[PDB]
Amino acid sequence: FEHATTVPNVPGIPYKALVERAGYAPLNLEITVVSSELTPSTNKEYVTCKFHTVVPSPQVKCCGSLECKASSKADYTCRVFGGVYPFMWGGAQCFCDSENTQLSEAYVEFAPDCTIDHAVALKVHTAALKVGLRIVYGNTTARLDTFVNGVTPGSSRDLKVIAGPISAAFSPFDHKVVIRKGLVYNYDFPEYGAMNPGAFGDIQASSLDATDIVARTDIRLLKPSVKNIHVPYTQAVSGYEMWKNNSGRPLQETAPFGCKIEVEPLRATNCAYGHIPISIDIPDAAFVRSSESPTILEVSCTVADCIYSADFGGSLTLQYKANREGHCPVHSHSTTAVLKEATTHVTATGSITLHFSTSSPQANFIVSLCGKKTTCNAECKPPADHIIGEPHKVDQEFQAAVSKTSWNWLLALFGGASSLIVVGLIVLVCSSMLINTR
Amino acid sequence: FEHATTVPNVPGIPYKALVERAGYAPLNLEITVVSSELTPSTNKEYVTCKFHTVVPSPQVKCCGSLECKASSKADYTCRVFGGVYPFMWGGAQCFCDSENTQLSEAYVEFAPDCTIDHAVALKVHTAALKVGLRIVYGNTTARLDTFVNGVTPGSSRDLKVIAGPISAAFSPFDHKVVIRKGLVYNYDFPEYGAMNPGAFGDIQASSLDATDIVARTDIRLLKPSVKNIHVPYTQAVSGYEMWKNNSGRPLQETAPFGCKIEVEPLRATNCAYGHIPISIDIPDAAFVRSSESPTILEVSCTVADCIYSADFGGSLTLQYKANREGHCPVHSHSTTAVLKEATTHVTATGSITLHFSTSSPQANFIVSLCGKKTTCNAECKPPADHIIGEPHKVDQEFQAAVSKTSWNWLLALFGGASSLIVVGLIVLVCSSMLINTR
Numbered sequence: 031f032e033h034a035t036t037v038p039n040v041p042g043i044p045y046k047a048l049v050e051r052a053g054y055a056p057l058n059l060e061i062t063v064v065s066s067e068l069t070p071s072t073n074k075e076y077v078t079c080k081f082h083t084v085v086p087s088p089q090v091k092c093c094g095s096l097e098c099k100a101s102s103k104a105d106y107t108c109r110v111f112g113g114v115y116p117f118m119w120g121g122a123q124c125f126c127d128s129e130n131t132q133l134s135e136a137y138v139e140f141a142p143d144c145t146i147d148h149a150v151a152l153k154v155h156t157a158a159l160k161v162g163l164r165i166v167y168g169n170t171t172a173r174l175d176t177f178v179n180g181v182t183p184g185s186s187r188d189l190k191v192i193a194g195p196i197s198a199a200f201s202p203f204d205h206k207v208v209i210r211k212g213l214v215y216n217y218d219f220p221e222y223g224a225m226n227p228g229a230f231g232d233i234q235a236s237s238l239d240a241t242d243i244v245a246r247t248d249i250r251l252l253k254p255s256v257k258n259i260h261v262p263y264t265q266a267v268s269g270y271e272m273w274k275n276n277s278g279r280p281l282q283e284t285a286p287f288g289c290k291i292e293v294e295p296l297r298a299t300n301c302a303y304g305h306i307p308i309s310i311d312i313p314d315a316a317f318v319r320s321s322e323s324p325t326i327l328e329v330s331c332t333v334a335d336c337i338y339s340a341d342f343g344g345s346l347t348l349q350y351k352a353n354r355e356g357h358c359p360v361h362s363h364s365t366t367a368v369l370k371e372a373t374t375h376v377t378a379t380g381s382i383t384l385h386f387s388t389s390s391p392q393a394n395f396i397v398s399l400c401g402k403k404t405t406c407n408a409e410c411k412p413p414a415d416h417i418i419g420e421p422h423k424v425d426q427e428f429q430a431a432v433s434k435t436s437w438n439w440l441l442a443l444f445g446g447a448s449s450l451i452v453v454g455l456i457v458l459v460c461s462s463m464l465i466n467t468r
Numbered sequence: 469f470e471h472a473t474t475v476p477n478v479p480g481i482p483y484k485a486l487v488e489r490a491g492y493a494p495l496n497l498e499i500t501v502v503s504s505e506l507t508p509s510t511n512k513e514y515v516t517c518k519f520h521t522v523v524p525s526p527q528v529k530c531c532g533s534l535e536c537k538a539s540s541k542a543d544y545t546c547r548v549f550g551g552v553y554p555f556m557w558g559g560a561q562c563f564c565d566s567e568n569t570q571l572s573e574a575y576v577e578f579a580p581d582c583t584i585d586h587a588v589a590l591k592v593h594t595a596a597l598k599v600g601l602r603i604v605y606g607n608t609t610a611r612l613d614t615f616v617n618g619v620t621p622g623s624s625r626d627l628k629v630i631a632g633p634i635s636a637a638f639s640p641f642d643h644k645v646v647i648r649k650g651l652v653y654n655y656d657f658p659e660y661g662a663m664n665p666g667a668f669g670d671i672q673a674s675s676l677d678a679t680d681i682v683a684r685t686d687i688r689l690l691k692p693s694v695k696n697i698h699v700p701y702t703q704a705v706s707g708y709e710m711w712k713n714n715s716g717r718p719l720q721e722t723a724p725f726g727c728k729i730e731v732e733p734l735r736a737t738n739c740a741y742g743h744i745p746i747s748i749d750i751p752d753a754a755f756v757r758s759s760e761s762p763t764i765l766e767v768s769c770t771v772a773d774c775i776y777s778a779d780f781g782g783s784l785t786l787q788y789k790a791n792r793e794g795h796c797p798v799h800s801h802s803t804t805a806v807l808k809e810a811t812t813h814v815t816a817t818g819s820i821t822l823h824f825s826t827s828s829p830q831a832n833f834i835v836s837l838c839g840k841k842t843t844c845n846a847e848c849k850p851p852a853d854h855i856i857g858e859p860h861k862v863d864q865e866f867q868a869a870v871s872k873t874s875w876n877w878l879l880a881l882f883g884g885a886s887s888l889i890v891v892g893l894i895v896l897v898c899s900s901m902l903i904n905t906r
């Protein structure tokens with residue numbers, strides 16, 4: 031049989047339900063969302079890391095001429111200079127009365143440390159959510175893991191179970207992101223082929239070990255200015271360390287709902303938000319006919335004591351009369367309250383307690399023992415402790431915090447002035463007629 | 469200097485422009501979009517291809533019992549059968565008075581041909597356009613290739629040139645696509661992990677040579693029914709050949725604007741649609757002062773004959789007086805008409821012809837020889853031939869097909885009834901006063 035139900039997106043929050051079929055005892059169904067797995071689609075754009083300038087041996091043409099030539103190396107620079115003043119420990123490298131000239135050039139390349147200090151700029155889209163569900167029926171536990179989509183049931187025992195789509199779409203990830211040393215940072219990285227000195231991603235490459243590179247970081251050559259042969263180079267500070275210094279806090283400290291983000295899939299997990307509708311198919315053989323089910327008689331409830339606690343602290347008791355030994359389930363069709371155990375033994379005239387929780391102080395509701403129903407009411411008090419991180423609000427508040435006494439007082443407050451005005455008008459018209467008599 | 473201009477998205481359509489700077493002769497600028505390259509971002513989802521069922525040797529337990537066991541193989545099936553009737557050329561394989569039983573099982577695997585018959589399902593997004601521009605200035609040709617974005621100028625001579633963004637976004641590709649044997653097909657492939665017998669992508673795999681596979685194609689075992697040992701298997705027809713038979717026409721025959729689609733990048737090229745704004749930076753040294761530019765005097769135009777042809781078939785002539793020898797550019801600031809050659813020699817009293825085209829039959833406009841301007845008018849006739857595929861409408865029609873004679877007739881048609889009614893009212897009030905005299 032197939033049953034439909036909506037569940038909150040949250041871990042460690044079992045949800046209990048029942049299936050009604052004529053001649054079959056209502057079957058307890060427990061559903062647990064073990065964890066969440068939001069995996070988006072992303073594409074590798076480029077990589078960046080601290081670079082190193084190249085300072086190759088300059089070219090010296092003595093007492094003659096020469097011309098500059100470009101080079102395919104990324105961020106390359108070249109420039110000639112006449113009237114050079116070459117000196118070295120060995121002395122004047124060559125000789126002519128200041129006629130000689132020298133060509134200098136430089137370029138950049140990623141340093142060896144980059145191999146492990148690389149930071150990759152990622153473009154992401156189409157967040158996809160994966161949900162793992164564990165379902166208990168007839169004290170039998172089955173499992174499945176399915177994409178949140180409502181069109182691809184998973185495989186578990188060759189059982190087709192579907193979930194979603196989500197009520198709302200949530201994704202902490204933004205279109206542009208960066209990954210560095212296992213830390214993910216939300217930032218609008220410059221597009222590939224865009225070089226801006228003193229900025230993130232100044233050096234860009236298709237792959238870490240790509241021979242072809244493109245970069246621009248405003249390198250300007252300086253004229254020789256000293257005795258010896260030297261190439262003074264002026265360049266802006268590397269942008270990688272710049273972004274490192276003031277990169278801001280990591281996404282791990284900014285993700286809403288406490289998403290637990292992992293890097294190797296670049297995906298979130300254990301993050302709770304939204305609702306999920308699901309349809310569960312259960313084999314008919316799993317069901318049990320009511321003929322063999324225990325029969326109960328003259329059952330009653332009693333709230334020994336309840337507390338309006340965030341955690342599961344509510345208690346209840348039931349007393350029953352029966353004729354057959356065995357087990358029956360227990361349920362509460364009121365969403366405001368949730369039980370703890372689904373089934374229990376049954377004796378001829380036994381009475382058993384129950385643990386439960388509620389989201390309202392007016393503990394009035396209907397609970398079913400085995401197949402039969404029964405009303406049960408009480409009032410609960412706020413707790414002394416008022417800060418706890420354990421599961422809370424298994425059912426969200428439904429403006430039911432208002433008390434029965436509050437309803438009685440509000441009813442006694444509003445007055446029936448409409449009846450007063452109606453009676454006044456009626457007597458007024460009657461008197462008007464009586465005086466039209468004259 | 470920097471100049472801004474908008475160009476249509478189309479190949480083989482040179483666009484001519486001028487830059488105005490005081491004391492500098494206007495510099496002809498020719499811009500050509502050599503080709504287009506629309507490259508989107510896509511992710512590999514899975515692969516599919518014709519499969520082959522596995523028919524392994526069945527298990528036979530003689531005169532005893534046995535139990536079925538599942539197998540991790542994709543789309544696996546298993547089933548036992550008692551009271552088997554085993555026979556073979558060698559005869560009754562084993563002996564017991566019908567007590568023996570046999571277990572049969574089967575699964576599926578991609579056939580060797582699949583290695584080259586594989587079809588990959590692709591998910592695509594964020595179409596990105598790449599434009600190659602060739603720019604001629606001062607009879608010097610330079611090139612660049614830039615992403616359509618307006619934030620990443622390209623590198624050519626270390627020159628920064630920017631283009632786009634597009635006026636409108638166009639992409640023949642859809643969210644879901646498939647690629648097979650170099651043919652791209654637009655189809656909503658079933659999501660990974662969704663098996664539907666008798667449909668496209670029945671067999672799915674992360675990679676072509678992935679040991680782990682998932683599939684379901686409704687295999688049911690049949691009981692032994694003959695003398696010999698045999699395993700009758702019933703299964704639905706393979707979905708790959710099914711989609712092949714009625715896959716529909718390829719995208720190559722459906723892409724708007726005649727996009728030329730290539731598979732190895734899964735990208736379109738040579739596809740024309742939309743407008744592109746661009747900014748071109750030109751070095752100051754490229755400009756030439758008006759002092760050295762040839763000086764012209766008393767220039768005049770003459771339309772020898774024009775034809776309202778789709779192709780470049782318009783002709784013109786100019787006669788000029790000058791004092792200096794050299795070259796000057798020629799331009800037309802009227803968008804409705806486009807010239808063919810940008811510059812020409814200049815003599816003291818020479819006269820030269822010109823080839824051009826127009827998008828309106830009213831060939832009235834202003835054209836500039838060297839620096840000076842001049843008005844020039846004529847009328848053009850439709851051509852005898854009225855089907856040609858060569859470049860047409862270098863400038864789109866601007867509701868200027870209306871003729872001067874049509875304007876004269878329309879002006880002579882509309883009448884000044886407003887003046888008539890005003891005069892009638894004035895004389896009416898005058899007469900009313902005259903009669904109020906009595």
Ligand SMILES: *[C@@H]1O[C@H](CO)[C@@H](O)[C@H](O)[C@H]1NC(C)=O
Binds near residue numbers: 168169356357
């Ligand atoms: C599940 O509950 C039924 C109900 O009495 C019981 O008969 C059965 O033995 C239980 N199964 C297990 C595994 O405890």
Ligand SMILES: *[C@@H]1O[C@H](CO)[C@@H](O)[C@H](O)[C@H]1NC(C)=O
Binds near residue numbers: 606607794
């Ligand atoms: C470009 O045109 C100018 C204008 O007269 C001329 O001086 C120059 O030689 C031309 N350049 C080439 C390469 O023809």
